[PDB]
Scaffold this active site. Structure first.
Site, PDB file in Angstrom:
ATOM      1  N   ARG A 187      -3.290  -7.347 -13.061  1.00  0.00           N
ATOM      2  CA  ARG A 187      -3.770  -8.635 -13.546  1.00  0.00           C
ATOM      3  C   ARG A 187      -5.190  -8.486 -14.088  1.00  0.00           C
ATOM      4  O   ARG A 187      -5.722  -7.371 -14.156  1.00  0.00           O
ATOM      5  CB  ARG A 187      -3.766  -9.661 -12.406  1.00  0.00           C
TER       6      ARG A 187
ATOM      7  N   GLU B 199      -8.556   0.900  -8.947  1.00  0.00           N
ATOM      8  CA  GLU B 199      -9.712   0.948  -8.043  1.00  0.00           C
ATOM      9  C   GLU B 199      -9.919   2.335  -7.424  1.00  0.00           C
ATOM     10  O   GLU B 199      -8.954   3.077  -7.234  1.00  0.00           O
ATOM     11  CB  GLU B 199      -9.583  -0.111  -6.946  1.00  0.00           C
TER      12      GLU B 199
ATOM     13  N   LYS C 116       0.808  -1.229   0.000  1.00  0.00           N
ATOM     14  CA  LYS C 116       0.000   0.000   0.000  1.00  0.00           C
ATOM     15  C   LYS C 116       0.846   1.286   0.000  1.00  0.00           C
ATOM     16  O   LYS C 116       0.439   2.295  -0.589  1.00  0.00           O
ATOM     17  CB  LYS C 116      -0.984   0.024   1.186  1.00  0.00           C
TER      18      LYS C 116
ATOM     19  N   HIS D 292     -17.629   1.892  -4.640  1.00  0.00           N
ATOM     20  CA  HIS D 292     -16.477   1.164  -5.157  1.00  0.00           C
ATOM     21  C   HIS D 292     -16.524   1.056  -6.676  1.00  0.00           C
ATOM     22  O   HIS D 292     -17.059   0.096  -7.238  1.00  0.00           O
ATOM     23  CB  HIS D 292     -16.347  -0.215  -4.506  1.00  0.00           C
TER      24      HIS D 292
END
Ligand SMILES: CC(C)(COP(=O)(O)OP(=O)(O)OC[C@H]1O[C@@H](n2cnc3c(N)ncnc32)[C@H](O)[C@@H]1OP(=O)(O)O)[C@@H](O)C(=O)NCCC(=O)NCCS
Ligand SMILES: O=CCCCC[C@@H]1SC[C@@H]2NC(=O)N[C@@H]21
Ligand SMILES: [Mn+2]
Ligand SMILES: [Mn+2]
Lengths: 716, 388, 115
Positions: B222, B206, B117, B139
């Site tokens: 990925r 994200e 992170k 999200h």
């Protein structure tokens, strides 16, 4: 529209019970499930149509790619399908073009070229179930044992590709130059007979390819400094096609790649190579040519009767092939005992050897097929030949007497060059002397065995566990038999004879059968007794004891008797000409007028039209057919046709492991059958049902997590 | 150039890739443990090999060197990691290339970049992307792809705002209730962080969004489980593109006919649900046990990605609960919703517990139909759990 | 070889009538049987009696060698009851010696019959 209409039968909508049914999913794919599923029964009264599979995509060609992939991925077993036809349309240049018309199908023949997807899943089940319930032939309908799962020590193939022994030698310096190299060696070079002659003696030639090739990696490293491997010829060609339903040419080819360092060797019968009747020269040529083209390096060429003129054809073929020609002298008699024979003398063998060298054989072989070469006779014999002739000498024998080792040791004293052996657990008795035994036997003696005991021990251990799979073919002989020095029956023969004796109701009189065996030999003028000439002497004794016949009343009573085919055949000279000749009285009575052959039967026969066999086999099958296919039908017509039907029925059986091959499976057993490197079928036999109205039993397998359904007609 | 593609995965995703390689005409290799001896993914490929038996269920897809052995004995030039096993493992990707094998994924410098992170945030700061200091967040995540020549394109956002804690329960693309500008900021930032670090192959950026403001979450270097959806609303084969991008093919080239950014749109709406052995009555703990009856949907706008769910072999506790990956497509969203619900009832699994009854009650619930749903949707909805 | 000599002289001294060799494992290899027995003869005045097991398969090879070195008696078994963990087969040994300076005192055919 995926349907059961047969593209190979004018779309006659096939019908029946769908065994497997597996789908395609994924991006761009859609399915409207009609009537096809899991275990559907397809009716003849409905618009037969199992699913509609349709693809979308931004671009036309991408739509086709998804359709093609979807079509191949779709799986429907049991009934027929138009799937192959749909695949072919997607491929086609006129379809992709977009510019096709309604004429397309009738204008486009290549569409109807389909190719049978040999369905190796169903066929493994359909085979396994069949042996499971109706059993293997020549076995026992018992459950299924084999409880020592001995692992298979193997050797990285890259390591192998870096060994460099005789196969390499033969490429650098040819036959003549290999034979010169043999001469230099102090050690005794050995030939292993494990793959061929060992089990042909001990296990009715039954050993399958899968076992041999399971251990090919290890054998290459173990016999890295060996002279040759004997892994073909003899009974193997016939027996593999027939009893084993496997292509010998495959065993050859496969063993070839696993062992690219060591000379390969077969037993080649002068007259008919490996066949069963008589053949025109060019069948001998063809056969040899193919053999050498596909891996065989040495050809031990023998005549059933030591008749030199009969081995010149095989010789010319081998010589052309650029391979190694080995002139054999079958040993009988006993050169120690001068009352035994004044033909099969020390001088007989010397001259014979000297003759073969003049024919240009690279190596002189001795084939004591009946294990009659007593130690002292082997010292004197071999001794004599080294200084008589220059060829390296290759001795082969059978531990039938228990003295095979002793004979070998003496032979080594006498300067011998090559011996035949077999790993301990596959030797002794009717087999060759044990390599393992011999290796220590020579300890503290001038010449040693050029080999590797520790690697050999491993082999013996393996083959021991593998021998267990062949328990049903274990021959009678449990101990050495020294009576072979009187009656002279080669290896087997005294087995079959006794099974035959007992069969013709002469079980308790076998001592007289033996006696007549030795007698018939001398009645026939004392002949060399290998196959097929040992069955001749076999049959007469058997027939003469059966009809209570004497030495003299075989002539006296002849004109009424009508002798065994094998005997009459012998006297026609259909097996060549024996060293002494034919007794003119005895021939006349047996032939009863029939024409006897002057020269070898080869130049009585017309040459085979190979392109006519091509013509016939191309038509009979779909259209493959090779040069190895051709000489193979010619040699064994019936057996080859029968192989092909089985290869059509069950695919490539040799791929099955031995125990499953002979026994099928037990309830709740999981086996793994390897169908091709990468494709292993994990099968489980869950249950089997009682037969129905038909005698059809239902076997519920699980294959790779999917359940399967097989119908097996129970013979009863 | 790619000659033999091996899939270092199992179940649905192995099958997904295998299908995509056999479209390109590439020989395929599968790998498995003793517990997948019965798996579907095994026979989907030309070859398949038991990765060492002495290895239990877990490491039989984690064991770096022993997987490469297989790769090497099979003469494999490319490996697809898929997800959730060695996918994000940068030691795997490294060792991979040292043995002549093309790792179908971002360059080794990206995997290291987007792991931890504290590095994830570091490269995001350089980009210009906003980062966290926090309730009611959304999200949203953006799919991008970029060849080994620079060129990157986003395949628009996926709304994953339906999640309990972990587990991205139900996923939608494109978003509903998200004004094209509000959401342009998100896709633009997505690509801005990707353009900076010269990204290669396909990944996801994200985000969490609050009315207008938004914050970077992580990068998944990925493919994604939920990729299904984006594929359907753009018509682009994502897994195909993956393989081809690794073989070094240009996006806008003739082998992946990529539209340039402005030409790429979304037609209609897609939604996917994972059908799992999770017991929506027992804190979502998966069932094990044997499947006795499996039966599925189809028809207009339904897309199935089969996995470990079928009429036979039992489900192990060792791998992820996932059985079937079901997705639906139409112009209107209401048509997509109706297709999921119906599809779900028609979906039939007997022998083990499923998340279906729950998964039904998420679709029926009109506060999901609105689009203005949030990460706390399962949090704030009790009638979502129903006895039925 | 030195231990075996010392042992033999001692057993001779102990007043035994016959020196025996027990090869209960069949370790006495061919050459070892020529050298051992060869020495023992000149070292001691006792008749040597040799007994092995055909576990190696060189039991016969061993007996011939022992015979070459002047051994007086061996231990043998009937063919169908010989070999492997048993004695070397008399039946074989009989024909094995054919052509060599020492013969086996026994009845050929009776032994086929016994077998
Ligand atoms: C060659 C192939 C494509 C079709 O050939 P076929 O003659 O119809 O079937 P084969 O005899 O070659 O294969 C025998 C059995 O091998 C099994 N099999 C195939 N690949 C396997 C693998 N990698 N591992 C284990 N088993 C395998 C299949 O079950 C097949 O039987 P099934 O059709 O009843 O399910 C087939 O071997 C196959 O299934 N390959 C993988 C799947 C595939 O290619 N799909 C198309 C694109 S995804
Ligand atoms: O009883 C027969 C059932 C079918 C088994 C067939 C095997 S195949 C190998 C062997 N050769 C034959 O001719 N049949 C058996
Ligand atoms: Mn032989
Ligand atoms: Mn004892």
């Amino acid at each position: 529209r995926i349907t059961t209409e047969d593209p190979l039968n004018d779309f006659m909508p096939d019908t029946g019970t769908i065994i497997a049914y597996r789908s395609s999913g994924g991006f761009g794919v859609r399915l409207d499930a009609g009537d096809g599923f899991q275990g559907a029964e397809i009716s003849p009264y409905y618009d037969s149509l199992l699913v509609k599979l349709s693809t979308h995509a931004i671009s036309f060609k991408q739509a086709e790619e998804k359709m093609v992939r979807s079509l191949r991925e779709m799986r429907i077993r049991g009934v027929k399908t138009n799937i192959p036809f749909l695949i072919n349309v997607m491929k086609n240049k006129k379809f992709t073009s977009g510019d096709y018309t309604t004429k397309f199908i009738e204008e486009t023949p290549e569409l109807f070229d389909i190719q049978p997807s040999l369905d190796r899943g169903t066929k493994t089940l359909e085979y396994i179930g069949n042996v499971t319930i109706n059993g293997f032939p020549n076995v026992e309908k018992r459950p299924k044992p084999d409880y020592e799962l001995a692992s298979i020590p193997t050797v990285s193939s890259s390591k192998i590709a870096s060994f460099s022994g005789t196969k390499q030698l033969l490429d650098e310096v040819g036959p003549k130059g290999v034979a010169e190299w043999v001469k230099k060696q102090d050690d005794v070079l050995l030939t292993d007979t494990t793959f061929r002659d060992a089990h042909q003696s001990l296990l009715a030639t039954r050993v399958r390819t899968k076992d041999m090739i399971n251990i090919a990696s290890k054998t290459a490293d173990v016999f890295k400094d060996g002279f040759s491997l004997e892994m073909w010829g003899g009974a193997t060609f016939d027996v593999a096609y027939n009893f084993l339903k496997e292509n010998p040419w495959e065993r050859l080819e496969r063993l070839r790649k696993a062992i690219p360092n060591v000379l390969f060797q077969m037993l080649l019968r002068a007259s008919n190579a490996v066949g069963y009747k008589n053949y025109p020269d060019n069948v001998i040529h063809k056969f040899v040519q193919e053999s050498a083209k596909a891996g065989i390096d040495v050809f031990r060429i023998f005549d059933s009767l030591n008749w030199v003129d009969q081995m010149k054809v095989a010789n010319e073929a081998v010589q052309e092939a650029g391979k190694i020609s080995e002139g054999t002298i079958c040993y009988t008699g006993d050169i120690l005992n001068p009352e035994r024979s004044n033909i099969y003398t020390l001088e007989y063998y010397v001259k014979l050897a000297k003759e073969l060298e003049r024919e240009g054989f690279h190596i002189l072989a001795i084939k004591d097929m009946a294990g009659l070469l007593k130690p002292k006779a082997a010292y004197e014999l071999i001794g004599e030949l080294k200084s008589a002739v220059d060829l390296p000498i290759h001795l082969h024998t059978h531990d039938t007497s228990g003295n095979g080792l002793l004979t070998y040791k003496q032979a080594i004293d006498a300067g011998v060059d090559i011996i035949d052996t077999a790993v301990a657990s596959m030797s002794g008795l009717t087999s060759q002397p044990s390599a393992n035994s011999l290796y220590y036997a020579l300890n503290g003696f001038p010449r040693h065995l050029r080999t590797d005991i520790e690697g050999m021990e491993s082999l013996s251990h393996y083959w021991s566990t593998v021998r267990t799979y062949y328990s049903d073919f274990e021959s009678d002989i449990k101990s050495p038999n020294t009576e072979i020095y009187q009656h002279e029956m080669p290896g087997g023969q005294y087995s079959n004879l006794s099974q035959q004796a007992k069969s013709l109701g002469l079980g308790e009189r076998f001592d007289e059968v033996k006696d007549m065996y030795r007698r018939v030999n001398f009645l026939f003028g004392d002949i060399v007794k290998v196959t097929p000439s040992s069955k001749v002497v076999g049959d007469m004794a058997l027939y003469m004891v059966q009809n209570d016949l004497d030495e003299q009343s075989v002539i006296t009573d002849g004109y009424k008797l009508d002798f065994p085919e094998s005997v009459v055949s012998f006297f026609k000279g259909e097996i060549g000409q024996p060293v002494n000749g034919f007794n003119k009285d005895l021939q006349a009575v047996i032939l009863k007028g029939q024409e006897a052959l002057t020269a070898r039967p080869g130049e009585y026969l017309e040459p085979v039209d190979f392109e006519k066999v091509r013509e016939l086999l191309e038509e009979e099958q779909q259209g493959p057919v090779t040069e190895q296919d051709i000489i193979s039908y010619v040699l064994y017509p019936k057996v080859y046709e029968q192989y092909i039907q089985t290869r059509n029925q069950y695919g490539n059986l040799s791929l099955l492991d031995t125990p499953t091959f002979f026994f099928g499976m037990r309830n709740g057993e999981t086996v793994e059958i390897e169908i091709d490197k990468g494709k292993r079928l994990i099968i489980k036999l869950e249950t089997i049902s009682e037969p129905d109205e038909n005698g059809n039993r239902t076997i519920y397998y699980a294959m790779n997590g999917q359940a399967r359904r097989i119908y097996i007609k129970d013979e009863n | 150039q790619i000659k033999k593609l091996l899939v270092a995965n199992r179940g649905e995703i192995a099958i997904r890739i295998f299908r995509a390689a056999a479209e390109l005409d590439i020989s395929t290799v599968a790998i498995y443990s003793n517990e997948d001896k019965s798996s579907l993914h095994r026979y989907k490929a030309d070859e398949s090999y038991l990765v060492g038996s002495d290895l239990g269920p877990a490491e039989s897809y984690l064991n770096i060197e022993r997987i490469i052995d297989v790769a090497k004995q099979a003469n494999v030039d490319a490996i697809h990691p898929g997800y959730g096993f060695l996918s994000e493992n940068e030691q795997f990707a490294r060792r991979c290339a040292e043995e002549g094998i093309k790792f179908i994924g971002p360059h080794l410098e990206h995997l290291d970049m987007f792991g931890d992170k504290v590095k994830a945030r570091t490269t995001a700061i350089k980009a210009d992307l906003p980062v966290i200091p926090i309730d009611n967040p959304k999200h949203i995540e953006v799919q991008v792809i970029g060849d080994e020549h620079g060129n990157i394109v986003h395949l628009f956002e996926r709304d994953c705002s339906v999640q309990r804690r972990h587990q991205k329960v139900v996923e939608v693309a494109p978003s509903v209730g998200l004004s094209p500008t509000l959401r342009q900021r998100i896709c633009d930032a997505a690509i801005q962080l990707m353009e900076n670090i010269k990204y290669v192959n396909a990944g996801t950026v994200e985000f969490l969004v609050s009315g207008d403001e938004f914050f970077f979450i992580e990068v998944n270097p990925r493919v994604q489980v939920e990729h299904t959806i984006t594929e359907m609303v753009t018509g682009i084969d994502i897994v195909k593109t993956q393989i081809l991008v690794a073989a070094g093919a240009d996006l806008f080239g003739e082998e992946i006919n990529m539209p340039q950014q402005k030409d790429i749109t979304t037609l209609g709406y897609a939604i996917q649900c994972r059908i799992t052995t999770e017991d929506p009555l027992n804190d979502f703990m998966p069932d094990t046990g044997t499947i006795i009856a499996y039966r599925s949907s189809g028809g207009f706008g339904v897309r199935l990605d089969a996995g470990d769910g079928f009429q036979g072999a039992e489900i192990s506790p060792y791998y992820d609960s996932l059985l079937v990956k079901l997705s639906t497509h139409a112009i209107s969203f209401k048509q997509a919703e109706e297709k999921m619900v119906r599809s779900l009832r028609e979906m039939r699994i007997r022998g083990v517990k499923t998340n279906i009854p729950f998964l039904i009650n998420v679709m029926k619930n009109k506060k999901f139909t609105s689009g203005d749903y949030t990460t706390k949707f399962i949090e704030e909805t009790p009638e979502l759990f129903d006895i039925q």
